[PDB]
Each structure stands twice: as C-alpha cells, then as structure tokens.
Amino acid sequence: KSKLPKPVQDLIKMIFGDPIDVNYEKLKTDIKVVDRDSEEAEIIRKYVKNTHATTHNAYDLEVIDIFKIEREGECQRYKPFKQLHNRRLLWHGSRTTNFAGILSQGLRIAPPEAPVTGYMFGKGIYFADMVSKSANYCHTSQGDPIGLILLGEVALGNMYELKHASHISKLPKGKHSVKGLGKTTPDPSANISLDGVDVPLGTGISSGVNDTSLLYNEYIVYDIAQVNLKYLLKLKFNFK
Numbered sequence: 001k002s003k004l005p006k007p008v009q010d011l012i013k014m015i016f017g018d019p020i021d022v023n024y025e026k027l028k029t030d031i032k033v034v035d036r037d038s039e040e041a042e043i044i045r046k047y048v049k050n051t052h053a054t055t056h057n058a059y060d061l062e063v064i065d066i067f068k069i070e071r072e073g074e075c076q077r078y079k080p081f082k083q084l085h086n087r088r089l090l091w092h093g094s095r096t097t098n099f100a101g102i103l104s105q106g107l108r109i110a111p112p113e114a115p116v117t118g119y120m121f122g123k124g125i126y127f128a129d130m131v132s133k134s135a136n137y138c139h140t141s142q143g144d145p146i147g148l149i150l151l152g153e154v155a156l157g158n159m160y161e162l163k164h165a166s167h168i169s170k171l172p173k174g175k176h177s178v179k180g181l182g183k184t185t186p187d188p189s190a191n192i193s194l195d196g197v198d199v200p201l202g203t204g205i206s207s208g209v210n211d212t213s214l215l216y217n218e219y220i221v222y223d224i225a226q227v228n229l230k231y232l233l234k235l236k237f238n239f240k
C-alpha cells in the first residue's frame with residue numbers, strides 16, 4: 001500500500017508501466033503535487049495556454065496534474081550557474097518511456113554513438129519557449145493521449161544566437177548557450193518572474209527575424225549542470 005498522494009501514485013504507474021513506493025525511491029527525486037489553487041499553478045496553466053503554436057493544430061492541451069520536482073544532488077550541481085544572468089523557465093518534452101531515466105540521471109547529452117539527426121546545433125540539451133514545440137517530442141497519439149513534459153530552469157547567460165543549422169565545435173568566448181531564432185516568439189513584454197526565473201508566457205507574435213530556418217525559438221546548453229528541473233506536467237492531448 002502506497003503512502004504517496006494518489007496523483008503521484010498514478011505518475012509512478014505511468015513512468016514504470018515492484019511496489020509503487022519502491023519504484024518512487026528509484027527516481028531519487030522529491031515529487032510534490034502543486035495545488036490547483038496556487039499562484040504557481042496559475043502561471044503554469046497560462047504558459048501552456050498562451051504558447052501553443054498556431055501551426056501545431058493537430059491537438060489541444062489540457063493540464064491534468066502539475067508536480068514540483070527536486071532531483072537528489074541538483075542543488076549542489078546547479079550551484080555554479082545559480083548566479084549566472086538570463087535564467088529562463090523552458091519546456092522539454094520526451095517519450096514517457098524515457099522519464100524513469102530522466103528523473104534518476106537528469107537530462108543528458110546524446111553520446112557519440114547516438115545519431116545527431118534532429119539536433120540542429122549538435123548534441124546538447126534542447127528546450128522550447130512554446131509548449132507545443134516540446135509537446136510534439138512526447139510522441140503521443142489518439143490511442144496513447146497522455147504525455148509528460150518538463151519545465152526546467154536553464155542558466156542561459158550570454159546566448160550565441162543562430163538562424164541556420166551549425167554543429168558548433170565550441171561556444172565562442174563569453175557565451176554560455178545557443179539560441180535558435182524563430183519567426184515567432186512569445187511577446188517579450190509579457191515575461192514575468194517566478195522565484196527569480198524569467199517565464200516567457202506571452203502569446204506568440206512575429207519576432208521580426210528574417211532569413212531563419214526556424215519557425216519557433218529553441219535553446220541549447222552543452223553542460224548538464226546548466227539545467228535545474230523544476231516542474232513535471234501530465235498533459236492530455238485532445239486530437240482533432
């Protein structure tokens with residue numbers, strides 16, 4: 001018999017497809033349900049509502065549960081970047097079968113033997129400011145319509161801003177991350193601050209960037225320590 005709250009029990013069953021509380025401990029992650037009533041929940045629901053891209057029209061999203069997460073050791077790992085400027089709360093989607101690994105080991109960079117296919121700025125950890133760009137990476141379907149998506153605090157610092165694929169060998173001097181510039185951006189005037197982290201939850205507007213290969217922004221870091229995972233959402237995909 002589990003002593004976890006029912007939403008966390010259900011999350012564990014989804015991730016592991018052993019007793020629930022034994023499986024919980026394997027994640028080496030503290031997981032808390034965010035109260036629907038709360039400021040954090042209001043902000044997160046607004047981020048989901050406002051940043052669904054117009055071209056991702058095969059589905060709408062409904063937030064089922066919001067969890068606050070703290071991986072073992074991440075406070076001390078993130079410490080060197082915790083004071084860097086330009087820390088942003090960004091989306092990362094992945095298949096449900098990857099989440100046991102993501103929570104226990106954190107987000108990782110693809111190893112040498114993995115293909116670079118799909119990584120326009122080379123192997124790194126990729127994030128979006130548009131929920132639906134990340135949600136596409138959950139590979140949900142009508143038949144399997146529930147997915148999981150992360151919100152990470154990402155220590156971007158000075159961004160190396162690019163408009164075309166380039167598998168850079170090294171970041172330029174003084175730069176901490178890559179940003180791919182999209183044609184569409186959340187309205188910067190609507191950014192808010194949550195616990196010292198910028199949240200780009202404005203509705204999508206034209207960025208005014210020309211000569212770019214990207215419809216929407218993306219953000220890449222090349223050091224696993226630049227990521228502090230903060231929330232995990234369970235999303236319902238309603239397909240049209």
Ligand SMILES: NC(=O)c1cccc2c1O/C(=C\c1ccc(C(=O)NCCc3nc4ccccc4[nH]3)cc1)C2=O
Nearest residue numbers: 091092093108109110114118119126127128134137218
């Ligand atoms: N995921 C996002 O939310 C995202 C947000 C914004 C932009 C992008 C987003 O995702 C992208 C690419 C993507 C993803 C997965 C693979 C893969 O699963 N590859 C398989 C090989 C592999 N093995 C790994 C082992 C450890 C870590 C990573 C690994 N990748 C490929 C491209 C983007 O361009």
